[PDB]
């Protein structure tokens, strides 16, 4: 943080403060005029309403714009400066030369469309990390050949400075400015900075198609909301009111699952094969009575047997409707059979095949009694009950006979059925399609609606009629323009909610765009759910196949992105590695030799000033060793981390550190990480690749075979 950086930050703060002062003055003037117009307009009612609504809309816009007025700044090759913000601010007494450009204005288009390879006559791009009315700091980016003298938290410009650069920039521009609007897959290797390219692509796509996505919304899926953070940073309106974030464990609304499942169970629970298992399991609930059920009508004892239940189930399954909908057919046929048997024995020998006037009435009486019969309904509930996903899975896992019926493996046994895991969430979401709703209807709401409409009709009747007006001439009456139904609805709650929360609480919502980060972790069922929740097939998918820790994660993109958009998805892989040194890249490749025979890695074109280091740990010196290391590194400069299993208190687990980059990294005892399931090698690869400048290694006896 050089003194020049501090001076620049102070100057930007002063400029933003001046902008906010002008905004406050405009707000005060608008509020004063709004109050005056409400009080003493003195004009026609329509004109008064128009002016009042315009002023109120302006005041609301100013209120919205208060949080983070200025996004960033653009420098033109002509030396001119452009400031992008939530509002357009112009100086009235300086020929309206803009002091702040609305982000939707054409002149602000380069802020989103411009790239290093293809700048739109822009030299440098800036972004302010706004916080309320204060700017914490800003990051600079050069839209051209890197200079190496700029400042930014990512420090990507400095690493790029340390042709190869032209080729990298051209590849990144080709990825970003792709004209496709369907499924796009980005898979760069470690150190290639594919995350930055993905964020830029998302910003460009959301800006270009903003007019047709402000109502569908955007869904962000991943371990961390960092993508949502950037969307809010560059597109605060969409992020605040249109963007929804959901970790793969939060697909089902209102169920914040966090528990993990063992590989033996997860690998099978996450596959499409489970769809057959779910269908069989719900079919099992269509069971039969082991012994005849005495229905015991009020007058004649009656019996249900296995054969009538057999026939009823056959009819229901023939219908093919969901469980709760085929319940109607099952109950209808059972009721008809029982009614016929009961009528045949009530009117003993007399009424059979007589005219409708007797047999139909007897049938109606029997059916009416049955509908109120408690034990008959209890029996109908004993077989073919009303089901919910939670109940279905809870009673499937906890019983050891139903798993055999459904064809599930013996491995997904667990004693407690209510202990949901992230792998059970997609099955809970899926089961809703299988089960459905039993034609649910509301009665109290209809009564309230009827009463309110009747009250509105009475109000309209209370007004004077045209037959006996006393005005000088005939004129429009309220009854000629509005009816009781519309007037009643005019005074109802009319609840309104933000699009973000409104969509977050709906399972059936279809989003305009889906952003997936670390996509290699998602299984077949997660992809099925996501593609069900986005019919437009507009996806931005980011990840690396070699870095998955979930055993059910995608083996390859084609295995996942081909059953929905075969031959229509676009694939782009970033090549060069510059965000990590050459020694770290060599270590990563050495680990990579255990994954695939070829495993084409991202070639490195940069080397660090100091090589990595390794040491042994003896007589339990790790406890003080980690403290000494972190004290030495943190106090010097930059951000340093310690990576290892939770067994060491001072270690950050690999499950959390995947999405971050650090100047210094210390991996402790890689053997334990290598022993952490089938993906231990991938975990160690990830942890080693997190390093950007310096890497330290602690091992017990000897370095891993690969190294």
């Amino acid at each position: 943080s050089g003194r020049d950086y501090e001076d620049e930050l102070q100057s930007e703060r002063d400029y933003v403060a001046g902008l906010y002062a002008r905004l406050d003055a405009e707000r005060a003037q608008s509020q004063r005029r709004y109050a005056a117009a409400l009080r003493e307009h003195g004009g026609t009612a329509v004109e008064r309403d128009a002016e009042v609504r315009a002023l109120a809309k302006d005041i609301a816009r100013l209120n919205v714009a208060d949080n983070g007025l200025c996004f960033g700044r653009l420098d033109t090759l002509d030396d001119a400066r452009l400031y992008i913000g939530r509002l357009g601010i112009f100086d009235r007494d300086n020929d309206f030369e803009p002091l702040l450009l609305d982000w939707r204005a054409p002149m602000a288009r380069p802020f989103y469309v411009a790239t290093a390879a293809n700048p739109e006559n822009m030299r440098r791009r800036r972004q302010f990390h706004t916080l309320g009315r204060k700017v914490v700091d800003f990051t600079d980016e050069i839209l051209g050949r890197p200079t190496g003298a700029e400042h930014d938290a990512t420090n990507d410009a400095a690493l790029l400075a340390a042709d190869i650069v032209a080729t990298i920039q051209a590849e990144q521009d080709q990825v970003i400015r792709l004209d496709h609007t369907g499924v796009l897959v980005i898979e760069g290797g470690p150190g290639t900075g594919k995350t930055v390219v993905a964020l830029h692509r998302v910003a460009y796509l959301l800006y270009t198609y903003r007019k047709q996505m402000e109502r569908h919304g955007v869904l962000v899926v991943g371990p961390t909301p960092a993508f949502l953070d950037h969307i809010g940073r560059v597109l605060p309106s969409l992020g605040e009111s249109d963007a929804v974030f959901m970790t793969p464990g939060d697909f089902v609304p209102g169920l914040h699952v966090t528990a993990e499942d063992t590989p033996e169970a997860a690998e099978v629970k996450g596959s499409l094969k489970i769809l057959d298992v779910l269908k069989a399991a719900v079919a099992d609930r269509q069971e039969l009575p082991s012994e005849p059920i005495p229905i015991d009508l009020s007058d004649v004892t009656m019996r249900i047997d296995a054969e009538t239940a057999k026939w009823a189930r056959d009819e229901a399954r023939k219908t093919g409707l969901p469980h709760n909908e085929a319940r109607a057919e099952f109950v209808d046929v059972v009721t008809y059979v029982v009614t016929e048997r009961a009528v045949a024995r009530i009117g003993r020998g007399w009424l059979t095949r007589d005219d409708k006037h007797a047999w139909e009435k007897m049938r109606a009486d029997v059916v009416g009694e049955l509908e109120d019969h408690e034990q008959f309904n209890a029996a109908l509930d004993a077989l073919w009950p009303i089901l919910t996903p939670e109940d279905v899975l809870a009673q499937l896992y906890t019983s050891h006979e139903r798993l055999r019926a459904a064809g599930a493996p013996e491995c997904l046994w667990r004693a407690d059925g209510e202990a949901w895991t992230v792998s059970d969430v997609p099955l809970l979401d899926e089961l809703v399609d299988l089960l459905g709703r039993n034609k649910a209807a509301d009665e109290a709401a209809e009564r309230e609606r009827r009463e309110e409409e009747a009250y509105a009709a009475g109000v309209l009747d209370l007004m004077v009629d045209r037959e006996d007006l006393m005005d000088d001439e005939d004129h429009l009456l309220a009854q000629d323009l509005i009816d009781a139904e519309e007037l009643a609805d005019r005074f109802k709650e009319q609840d309104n909610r933000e699009l973000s929360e409104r969509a977050a609480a709906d399972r059936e919502w279809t989003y305009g765009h889906v952003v997936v980060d670390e996509a290699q972790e998602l299984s077949e069922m997660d992809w099925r759910l996501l593609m069900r929740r986005c019919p437009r097939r507009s996806f931005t998918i980011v990840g690396d196949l070699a870095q998955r820790r979930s055993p059910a994660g995608a083996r390859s993109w084609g295995a996942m992105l081909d059953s929905y958009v075969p031959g229509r998805w676009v694939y782009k892989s970033l090549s060069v590695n510059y965000r990590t040194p050459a020694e770290i890249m060599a270590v990563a490749a050495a680990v990579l030799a255990e994954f695939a025979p070829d495993a084409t890695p991202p070639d490195s074109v940069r080397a660090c000033g100091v090589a990595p280091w390794a040491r042994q740990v003896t007589d339990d010196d790790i406890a003080s060793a980690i403290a000494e290391f972190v004290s030495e590194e943190a106090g010097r400069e930059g951000t340093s981390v310690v990576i290892g299993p939770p067994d060491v208190p001072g270690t950050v687990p690999p499950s959390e550190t995947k999405g971050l980059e650090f100047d210094a990294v210390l991996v402790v005892e890689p053997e334990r990480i290598l022993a952490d399931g089938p993906r231990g090698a991938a975990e160690l690869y990830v942890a080693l690749t997190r390093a950007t400048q310096r890497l330290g290694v602690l091992y017990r006896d000897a370095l891993p075979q690969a190294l």
Binding site: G182, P535, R536, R537, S538
Partner: protein, 49 residues
């Protein structure tokens, strides 16, 4: 060119011209027998002739 149309086609649980014609006929004439001749004829006589 449109993904929504392709999705609708994928989720359309009807195949062949005759089956679709029968579905439309039973939709417009629920109480009439599902004869193929009428199923083909009504659609032609509804809009195109």
């Amino acid at each position: 060119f449109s993904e929504i149309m392709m999705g609708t086609l994928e989720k359309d649980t009807t195949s062949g011209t005759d089956e679709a014609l029968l579905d439309i006929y039973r939709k417009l004439r629920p109480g009439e027998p599902p004869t193929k001749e009428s199923a083909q004829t009504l659609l032609e006589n509804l809009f195109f002739k």
